[PDB]
Amino acid sequence: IRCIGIGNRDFIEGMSGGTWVDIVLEHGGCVTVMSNNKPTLDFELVTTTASNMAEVRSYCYEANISEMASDSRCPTQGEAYLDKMADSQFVCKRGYVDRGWGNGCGLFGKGSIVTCAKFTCVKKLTGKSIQPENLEYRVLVSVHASQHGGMINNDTNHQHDKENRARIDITASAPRVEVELGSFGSISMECEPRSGLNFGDLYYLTMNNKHWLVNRDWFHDLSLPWHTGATSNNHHWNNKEALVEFREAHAKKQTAVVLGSQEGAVHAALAGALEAESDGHKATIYSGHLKCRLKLDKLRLKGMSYALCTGAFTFARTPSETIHGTATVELQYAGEDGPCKVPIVITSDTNSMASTGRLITANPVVTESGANSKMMVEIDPPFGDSYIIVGTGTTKITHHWHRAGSSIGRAFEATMRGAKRMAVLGDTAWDFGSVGGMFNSVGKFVHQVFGSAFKALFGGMSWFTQLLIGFLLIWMGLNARGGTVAMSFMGIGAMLIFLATSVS
Amino acid sequence: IRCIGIGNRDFIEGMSGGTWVDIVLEHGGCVTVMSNNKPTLDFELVTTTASNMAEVRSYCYEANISEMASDSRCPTQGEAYLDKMADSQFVCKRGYVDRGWGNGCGLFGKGSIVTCAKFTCVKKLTGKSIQPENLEYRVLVSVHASQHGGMINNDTNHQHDKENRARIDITASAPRVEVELGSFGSISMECEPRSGLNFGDLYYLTMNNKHWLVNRDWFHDLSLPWHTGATSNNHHWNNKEALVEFREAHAKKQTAVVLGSQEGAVHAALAGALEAESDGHKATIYSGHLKCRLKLDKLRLKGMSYALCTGAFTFARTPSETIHGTATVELQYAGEDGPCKVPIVITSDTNSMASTGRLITANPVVTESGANSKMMVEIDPPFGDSYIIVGTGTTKITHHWHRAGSSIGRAFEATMRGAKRMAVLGDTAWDFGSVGGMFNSVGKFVHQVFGSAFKALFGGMSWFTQLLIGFLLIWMGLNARGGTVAMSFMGIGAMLIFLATSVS
Amino acid sequence: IRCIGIGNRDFIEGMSGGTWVDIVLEHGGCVTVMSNNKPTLDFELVTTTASNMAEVRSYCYEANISEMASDSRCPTQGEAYLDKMADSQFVCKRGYVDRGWGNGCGLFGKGSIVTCAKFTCVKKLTGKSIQPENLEYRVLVSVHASQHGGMINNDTNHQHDKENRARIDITASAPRVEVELGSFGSISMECEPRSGLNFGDLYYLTMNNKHWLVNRDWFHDLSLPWHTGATSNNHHWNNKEALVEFREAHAKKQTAVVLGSQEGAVHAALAGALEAESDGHKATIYSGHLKCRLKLDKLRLKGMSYALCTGAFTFARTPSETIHGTATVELQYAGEDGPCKVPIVITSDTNSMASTGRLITANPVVTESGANSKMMVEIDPPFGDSYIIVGTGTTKITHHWHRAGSSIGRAFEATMRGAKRMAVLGDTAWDFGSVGGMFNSVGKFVHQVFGSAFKALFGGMSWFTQLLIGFLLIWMGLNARGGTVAMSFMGIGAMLIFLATSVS
Amino acid sequence: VEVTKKGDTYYMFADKKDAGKVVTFETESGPNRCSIQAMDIGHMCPATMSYECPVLEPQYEPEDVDCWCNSTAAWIVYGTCTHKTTGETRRSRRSITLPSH
Amino acid sequence: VEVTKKGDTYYMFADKKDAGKVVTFETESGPNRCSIQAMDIGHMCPATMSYECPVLEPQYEPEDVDCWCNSTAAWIVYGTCTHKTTGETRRSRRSITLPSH
Amino acid sequence: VEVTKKGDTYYMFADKKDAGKVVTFETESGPNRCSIQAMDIGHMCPATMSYECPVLEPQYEPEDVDCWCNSTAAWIVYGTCTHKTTGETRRSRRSITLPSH
Amino acid sequence: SKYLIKVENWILRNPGYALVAAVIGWTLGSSRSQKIIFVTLLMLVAPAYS
Amino acid sequence: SKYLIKVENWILRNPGYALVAAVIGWTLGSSRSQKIIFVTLLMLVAPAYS
Amino acid sequence: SKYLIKVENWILRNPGYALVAAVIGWTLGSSRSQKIIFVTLLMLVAPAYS
Ligand SMILES: *[C@@H]1O[C@H](CO)[C@@H](O)[C@H](O)[C@H]1NC(C)=O
Ligand SMILES: *[C@@H]1O[C@H](CO)[C@@H](O)[C@H](O)[C@H]1NC(C)=O
Ligand SMILES: *[C@@H]1O[C@H](CO)[C@@H](O)[C@H](O)[C@H]1NC(C)=O
């Protein structure tokens, strides 16, 4: 039920006999996977986790100085000398100053003056690199089990039945994971962290308990003191003159000064930069998509063998409507019959009693055996006016529903979305290895690209007339001697035969 | 035996009746000379010796100064003067400095100041020239006398029988030398030190007990004090201002300073230079080839008249194989029969007993009359598999041997090497003087260029069939009226007749 | 005689009856004007004089300051104010400085500080403009009066007979001048100062008793204090901040400093500039040519009526030769006959006695009546060998002379020079006013362009044969029906008739 | 030092000798002790630097200030030249350059 | 002020209180009277400015010099901070700017 | 210091100890007090700097001169080396470079 | 809008009878546009029998 | 390699008989290439009589 | 050089006789170049009668 209130929601349906199915997950969206006999699953990607990041360079915005010393020699004495020059922690500058009888020596000529002082970095910021083997994605998996749908369980402490929700950590070391959903069964996932945001031109900047991302060509352009890329208590700094300002000149000395806090300059320069969050030493990124392949072999239903409900069904409120034309129904059941299957139908008139639409949640069931229990389901009503009927006998309730739009419009939108998805799945879509899965791959993707329109167009899914139409179309394409008219017709005929062979 | 372990080894064979023979010696290789009735000789060039080298120029890298003096005159007094100006050991510089009432005289103008100081060269390096008449080459001559072949005699102190090895000093004064090999006989050598490394654009640089070679166009380009080679206690120097730095400008004086040791600069500049070694005043060069002509008139064998060995022959170890496809055999003889000829044959099968290969060492013999003695020989096995048999009677021993490659390949390689050698021998190859030696010269070089293939190709050296083939080829070339078919055929026929007339 | 030693010397000859004649004077050359009955004149241009030049702008390189004052206000007080701001002689600058409790007031914000000081220009340079009405040219006029030719009279104090030399000041106000040469007569000159060096893109820079000329497109580009030319004791300056360097603002003050003498910078920038000289307020320029027109109406000879010399003539030295093939002869006369005409002839042989050349100095005469007097003359010998004869009777002296070159070569060179001169005389060459002077103008310039070749080519100046040649050429051109052959021939015939009608 | 008043404002003519020492004078409020810490003070000559230095509370120590009095704000003035040679320091060393041509 | 010698050179530990006054000490040559005109002198704290100030003849006036003694050249050292708050003045106001992106 | 005369000219052999002090000697004119302000003076050793220092009138201050006597011009000479180790300073640091090849 | 979706859903519910009616009305027009009008007539009267 | 050197040495040992066999087998082919195959056959069978 | 200037000056001294001789020698040649040679002959022999 985690996929209900999401703006960017898709719909993926696989072949009836097709166990494998590929999907793409975006960091701001969700994916709903449904089948004929398998329960509906909902996949979401929460956060990109970066851990164990190496350090490349650290800059020092605010620094201090101490023990300023200077030494002056006038002409015919050579260059000035100081013992602290050989020390790596003391920075000095040389210069030439005018001298005379007022300064101690007689010959009038410019003298050599040197001035150095210590350098201590009181505050600093750091830059880290990001390697593909360090990334770790987190995906939550939910199951439509006719849950109550109440938002009271925000954290992961409790109120989360381990058979209804799960979390999976996809790492670059082992991309193959086995997910256990308890009574529902087990699934397999193989995710490939590719075609994401480039991490070869990005540096993770940590500064004053805040974090940003910067460009590598800009990080080296910054004009501040910097050290070598090693972990040392005290490291040989470089280009520290940019933080120590020397006066013009003096006949006997030179007084250096240190610049103030450069935090404001960095905050102003990083205005148009991306931000992130961090916990301890790990970082969280909210950008990046993922491609995955799911194997659904041991996944089954939970209430397929249950009986019918012989109690009283009642609406809890007016059924709401989502942006994707899906209707959520919240039912309250009275009686004590235990877990029983919920008899619900969608038709065009109260006397017709003919299924006209499909259900997003397969096998709606009540979870507890209480007297007055509650449950929720999600369905897809047909375009136009429709009637939802719940229950049997003289106690069955009916409700009117309306939905705007057109079937052809939705079909074309879904076809375009599937084409865009298949275009995103450029690599790792087919397999050119052992033979026997190539035809399976071409059938699988033609299904994933055309089934949304096949189900919407070809009548009431009789599975008998469509085969005859395909046969007659193959015959019409066969008895044609002209070029470019038999190949396309036979291809379309085979496509329709295969799409009818799959689940409708 | 000095020519066994050499990578660059050649093989020279002369005409049967041809006494004179030309050779070329490289400083990194060896030459083996063999004949039909003459013992095998081995020539090598050890070192190029340069002695009595003249001196051209000497530089002074590190220098000292002392007794600095200066003299200043202000305007309306003329040029400054000092008594030490006329001395060649004192260097001074002139200049103009601003003067006033503070400096002694009244008029406000700039004056003339001069400053000189002594110059003493504490350390210096020297440059020598190399003349062709100073060079002296050293060539060692060894004789294959079935020596033990032990490498225990490295120097020239002892363990070198004077009848088996010799040393020759080829000088530019007398290029004709007569070599005495004791019982073997005497030979004559005429060597021409030509086409060697050019010594007209090279200078021998001596510095700090080390030596180098430099270019003449670069030696004069160096910017340092210098003086030519004149035997004296005190030398006059030129361009010494490059080592004495004067200060800017002072009204009453000028303090000069001397530069430090420039040994590091010279060591850095001479990084990509060639090096050598020296002993006392002589120098050793390891580059340069030589051309020689040998006259072998009084050279004979030593054990041609000896009898056969009726003792016991045994192998001392597995016979080794060199890079040139030559096999060394180390034999141990038991018995007391005195110096006797070693009966050894090379065949294809134990029952064939037919000589199929040649011997690099002519007339293998035992040197001492001891009970258990040892000896060594070097042979050339035929391509493929072969059997070496030593001794006669029921005590003869046999050994299997194999050698890869092809006879045509070796023949072509030897022909190309002989062509390259004859191309190196550009001058002093033929004689255009008295007639009678021109045909001898053309026959000699066609033999030295084609005998390696003649012996390898034309059958089993029967000396009877080859004459008939030559006669029939001459006849076929004679009865042909067409052009360009009789000249080449007659030439090839005469070439083959001559090559069969010579030694095979 | 002022035109003898000049490299760029021309020769101008006018028509016999033609009084007016135009000439061009260059600042580095001379002009010689000769006629049949008029004495030879020599015109030269000495210096271009510029006076009464207006002032455009003045710069101040070295300046002083005094009475520096400042005023600072911190936030919640408004802008700073000072009474000296409204004064034009005090320059101030504003700024914003950080303040706090350490600086006097409470609120922690940055304030407004202003600082001004007086400005007094101790030394300055000036810029003047040059107008055409200010220029004044000076031309010296000499007369060939057989003067001694001694260079002992350099200045204008004495030793300059007022009838032999004169000076003329050509101004833009009155270009018409009347020259009096004493006994020789009077001439008229009309000079037009046109086509000279452009004075619309040049500024006359005066600095430290030195003077230069600069470009207007650089004079305004200089970044220094400046003020226009206004007669006053105290001037208002603009853009003086370029000479006063303000120290970084302190907590509540600002100390300004003044730059040193910028004379070195100006001397370095004016390295590639033109220089000149000045006297008082006038300037002297050595570049610029001039065009003039001379009217010779009242000019006559001085010794035309004198008698012959019956004394003794002698050479004073070997006659010299100038670059223009002219021969100077220095004669010494013995006897007391008073001013008498010098009988001199130029011929080809001592017995021929036929005038073959012309004289550059007309009517050579002795000036004094002394016993032993001296005189000088300048003649043009014919190409080849010639004899100069001086005197009559048995006391006449002869001298040989030789001159290389060819008559046709000199004729062509003079024709090309005359063509160049006529091309320089673009405007004011002809007159398009009243009729009657147009034919005079075309004849005058065709004469000035072709007479140098006419005199050199057409025989011995018989004045009788040339007319017959012209008549026959006119007849040959007349009896010709073909086009482009009668017009050119008739034109050349008329040209030759006119050139023969003039003086030869 | 000389103490005058021109237009209800006090001027303190301080020469070079009184450098780094305090001075007490009288104002309309009463006695005023004012300290002078002028570092760039020079000899007496026409080049005179003048700047107001302000009154401040005793508890707050001066900071980057070389003149302070406690009655009111006092304007200080003193010459700035070298060895009474009627010459300013003019040690700017800007070395302004001009275009060649 | 404290006067010590470490390696044949004299160090004068001068605090804030001794600012603008002379002091007499003893050297190997004899008595030495040395004047101190330190303008940027501060309180005692780790930030210590130290500079040798040279001997000169009394017949010359000091030029651009704030320390001079007459026995030899003497090395002066003094702290530079504000109100003993262990903080330097650091009033540079350079305001270095960085590229945006 | 030693004072000698060789050829009507006075030489003053001054060692390192007499550095910065005046000395009085006798000449044909009378007593002469001559001051020496040599800064780079060294110990006694073969490297000897010698330069004439001139007489001048006492009513003028010295401008660029470190030696001045008042009878005549006097030639001063003194060694220039370090710690009497028979070694000159030779601190030029020119570092002349040679072509490689 | 209000009626197009209804007839569209009706066609998609039982397309066989709809195609039968369409092919019946296709051959009952004198001109091409007349056949188009007749089949759109059947398309419009299809939802309500009345 | 292993057999080429053997047959080469055999040919070079007794070239007369080898050339006799070659000239005999040269004239026993119908075409040029057939003669070449026949002589290479003789070349190959030359080492071992069997 | 040495003789050209002399004959040139001679021609310029008395051009009538020179032109007479030139026009006389012009009509005594068989070809154009021959006439040119004959007139240059007269030009050269003009200075010295001999
Ligand atoms: C200024 O401060 C001094 C400090 O002792 C004090 O004596 C004087 O009275 C004060 N003047 C005032 C408050 O006007
Ligand atoms: C330094 O000068 C002072 C000035 O009074 C004097 O008392 C003292 O003796 C001098 N020290 C010397 C000469 O060593
Ligand atoms: C040099 O000057 C001193 C000044 O005290 C004087 O005593 C001495 O006599 C002078 N020497 C002369 C004039 O030779």
Tell if the CB–CB gap between A102 and E62 is shorter than 8 Å.
yes
Integer Cα distance of B89 and B87 in angstroms: 6
Contacts of C431 (CB under 8 A, 6+ apart): C437, C438, C441
F59 lines ligand 3 (CB under 6 A): no
Interface check C355 vs I, CB under 8 A: no
Going by CA atoms, what residue is nearest to atom 11 of ligand 3?
F32
CA distance F65 to chain A (A): 6
Residue C211: DSSP 8-state? E
Q: How far is CA C43 from the centre of its chain?
A: 11
Please choose, from the candidates A77, A66, A86, the residue with its C-alpha nearest in 3D space to the C-alpha of residue A113: A77
Q: Identify all chain A residues contacting G5, using CB atoms and an 8 Å cutoff.
A: 383-384, 406
**Which residue type is seen at B149?**
G
Q: Helices H, strands E: what count in chain C?
A: 6, 32
User: CATH fold of E2-79, please?
Assistant: HSP40/DNAj peptide-binding domain (2.60.260)
Q: What is the secondary structure of C50-92 as a DSSP string?
A: E-SPPEEEEEEEEEE----EEEEE-SSS-S---GGGS-TTEEE
Tokens of A223: 């004009």
**Residues framing ligand 1 (Cβ under 6 A):** D 29-33, 70-71
How many whole angstroms separate alpha carbon D21 and alpha carbon D38? 9
Would the CB atoms of E83 and D64 count as touching at under 8 Å? Answer: no
- C-alpha B343/C-alpha C119 separation (Å) is 123
Report CA-CA distances (Å) from C160 to B176, C141, C164: 99, 12, 7
Resolution of the model in angstroms: 4.2
Residue A430 CA neighbour count, 13 Å, CB half: 13
- CA F40 to chain B, closest CA, distance in angstroms equals 10
Reference B322, options B376, B389, B265; nearest CA is B376
How do the domains of chain F map onto residue ranges?
2-79
Dihedral over Cα of C311, C316, C317, C319: its sign: negative
What separation, in Å, do the N-terminal and C-terminal C-alpha atoms of chain B show? 24
Q: How many Å apart are CA C365 and CA A330, to the nearest integer? A: 147
Can you tell me whether residue C31 is helix, strand or coil?
Answer: strand
Closest residue by Cα to residue C9 from C381, C23, C356? C23
How many CB pairs below 8 A link D and E?
17
Size of interface A-E (CB pairs under 8 A): 101
Q: Which two structure tokens, joined as six digits, stand for A438? A: 């190539």
Tell me the C-alpha distance between B120 and B236, whole Å: 10
Residue nearest to atom 13 of ligand 3 (CA): F71
Given CB atoms, is C248 within the 8 Å cutoff of chain E? yes
- Do the strands C358-359 and B9-13 form a parallel or antiparallel pair, or are they unpaired? unpaired
Neighbours of E59 (CB within 10 A): 7
Residue pair F73/B243 in contact (Cβ under 8 Å)? The answer is: no
Nearest to B212 by CA among B121, B122, B128: B128
* Whole-angstrom Cα Rg for chain A: 36
Angle separating helix axes B407-424 and B438-457, nearest 10 degrees: 160
Q: Nearest 5 degrees, angle CA B453-CA B455-CA B461? A: 150
Pick the closest to residue B174 from B195, B186, B188, B191 (CA basis). Answer: B191
Chain C: residue nearest E82 by CA? C102
Query: What span, in angstroms and rounded, lies between the C-alpha atoms of A500 and A492?
Result: 12
The residue whose CB lies within 8 Å of the most ligand 2 atoms, and thus the one to mutate among E33, E34, E59, is E33
The amino acid occupying position B319 is P
Residue E82: its chain C contacts at CB < 8 A?
Answer: 102
CA distance H48 to chain B (A): 14
Eight-state DSSP code of residue B485: T
Give the three-class secondary structure for C332: strand
Calpha distance A368→C501 (Å, rounded): 147
Angle at B144 between CA B139 and CA B149, to 5 degrees: 95
Q: Give yes or no for a contact between C141 and C78, defined as CB atoms under 8 angstroms apart.
A: no
Find all residues with CB under 8 Å of H50, minimum gap 6, and list them: none
Name the nearest CA neighbour of C357 among C365, C366, C349, C348.
C348
> What is the C-alpha separation between B473 and B480, in angstroms, rounded?
11
Q: Which chain F residue is nearest to residue B260, measuring alpha carbons?
A: F90
Q: Do B24 and B421 meet the contact criterion of CB atoms below 8 Å apart?
A: yes
CA B59 – CA C37 distance, rounded (Å):
84
In which residue are the tokens 């510029």 written? C50
Selection from B10, B8, B5, B6 nearest residue B449 by Cα = B10
Taking the CA atoms of B169, B170, B172 and B178 in sequence, report the sign of the dihedral they define: positive
Burial B322-335 (b: 16+ CB within 10 A, else e): eeeebbbbbbebeb
Q: Where are the beta strands (DSSP E) in A391-501?
A: 397-403
From CA C30, how far away is CA A127, in angstroms rounded?
85
Q: CB under 8 Å to G31, separation ≥6 — which residues?
A: none
Distance of CA D72 from the midpoint of ligand 2 (Å): 42
Task: Name the minimum distance, in Å, from the CA of C229 to any CA of chain D.
Answer: 23
Which residue has a Cα nearest atom 7 of ligand 1? D33
Per-residue burial over I26-41, b if 16 or more Cβ lie within 10 Å, else e, is eeeeeeeeeeeebbee
Q: How far apart are CA B142 and CA B184, in angstroms?
A: 12
Cβ-contact A258, E90 below 8 angstroms: yes
Residue D78's identity, in one-letter code, is Y
Neighbours of chain G (3+ CB pairs under 8 A): A
Which of D27, D29, D32 gets mutated to test ligand 1 (max ligand atoms within 8 A of its CB)? Answer: D32
- Name every chain I residue with its beta carbon within 8 A of the beta carbon of C386: none
Interior/surface letters A453-482, b for 16+ CB within 10 angstroms, e for the rest: bbbbebbeeeeeebeebbeebbeebeeeee
* CA E70 to ligand 2: nearest atom: 1
Q: What's the CA gap between C65 and C225, in Å, rounded? A: 14
| Whether H15 and B384 lie within 8 Å, measured CB to CB | no
- Yes or no, beta carbons of A221 and E99 under 8 Å apart: yes
Q: Which helix (H) or strand (E) holds B372?
A: strand B372-380
- Tokens found for residue B454: 């003649």
Dihedral sign for Cα C463, C465, C466, C467, please: positive
Question: What type of residue sits at position A369?
Answer: S
| Amino acid type, C468 | L
Q: C383, C410 in Cβ contact below 8 A? A: yes
Handedness of CA C375, C380, C382, C384 (dihedral sign): positive
C-alpha–C-alpha distance, residues C269 and C61, integer Å: 13
Give the C-alpha separation, B418 to B126, whole Å: 44
Residue A439 backbone dihedrals phi, psi, to 5 degrees: -60, -40
Interface of D with E (CB under 8 A): 20-21, 37, 39, 61, 63-64, 66, 82-83
**Paired sense of beta strands F10-13 and F74-79, if any:** parallel
Chain D CA closest to residue C222 = D98
In order, the DSSP letters of B281-327 are TEEEE----EEEEEE-SS---SSSS-EE--SEEEESSPPEE-TTS-E
Q: Could you tell me how far CA E89 lies from the centroid of its own chain? A: 17
Rounded CA-CA distance C490/C470 in Å is 9
Contact C255, D41 (CB under 8 A): no
Q: Which amino acid is at C452?
A: S
DSSP notation for B395-429? G-EEEEEEE-S-HHHHHHHHHHHHHHHHHH--SSS
State yes or no: chains H and G have 3 or more CB pairs below 8 A.
no
Residue D12 Cα to ligand 1 midpoint, Å, equals 17
* Beta-bridge partners for B25: B290
Contacts of D87 (CB under 8 A, 6+ apart): D81
D49, D53, D92 member nearest C259 (Cβ): D92
Tokens of B499: 């090559």
Q: Where are the beta strands (DSSP E) in C156-238?
A: 165-171, 176-180, 186-192, 202-207, 210-215, 226-228
Classify the C-alpha dihedral E10-E16-E17-E20 as positive or negative.
Answer: positive
Any idea which ligand is nearest the CA of F21?
2
As given in the structure block, the two tokens for residue B404 are 């890869």
What is the per-residue DSSP string for C484-501? TTHHHHHHHHHHHHHHHH
Nearest to A258 among E46, E54, E90 (CB): E90
All residues at 6 or more sequence positions from A449 whose CB lies less than 8 Å from its CB, including other chains: A415, A418, A419, A422
Tokens representing D78 are 């003193």
Contact status, residue B205 vs residue B222, Cβ threshold 8 Å: no
Give residue D2 CA to ligand 1 midpoint distance, Å.
Answer: 19
Q: Please choose, from the candidates B253, B311, B290, the residue with its C-alpha nearest in 3D space to the C-alpha of residue B47.
A: B290
The contacts of residue F94 (CB under 8 Å, 6+ apart) are: B245, B259
Q: Which helix (H) or strand (E) holds C416?
A: helix C407-424
Taking each helix axis as running N to C, give the angle between helix A407-424 and helix G4-13, from 0 to 180 degrees, rounded to the nearest 10. Answer: 70
Asked if C406 and I14 come within 8 Å (Cβ–Cβ), the reply is no
Q: How far apart are CA B350 and CA A286, in angstroms?
A: 89
CA torsion sign, B191 to B192 to B197 to B202?
positive
Q: Using a CB-CB distance cutoff of 8 angstroms, which residues of chain E are in contact with residue C248?
A: 93
Binding pocket residue ranges, ligand 2, CB within 6 Å? E 29-33, 70-71
- Ligand 2 centroid to residue F21 C-alpha, Å: 15
Q: Could you give phi then psi for residue B470, rounded to 5 degrees?
A: -60, -40
Query: For residue C113, what are the CA distances in angstroms to C92, C101, D65, D93, E89?
Result: 10, 17, 15, 25, 21
The span from the first CA to the last CA of chain G, in angstroms, equals 22
CA distance A397 to A343: 11
C 181-210 residues with CB < 8 A to I: none
Asked if A213 and A231 touch (Cβ cutoff 8 Å), the reply is: no
Tokens of C4: 């003898």
DSSP chain H: -TTHHHHHHHHHHSHHHHHHHHHHHHTT-SSHHHHHHHHHHHHHHSS---
Choose the closest CB to F90 out of B71, B100, B260. Answer: B260
Domain H4-45 CATH assignment equals 1.10.1040.10: no
DSSP lists the bridge partners of residue F68 as F35
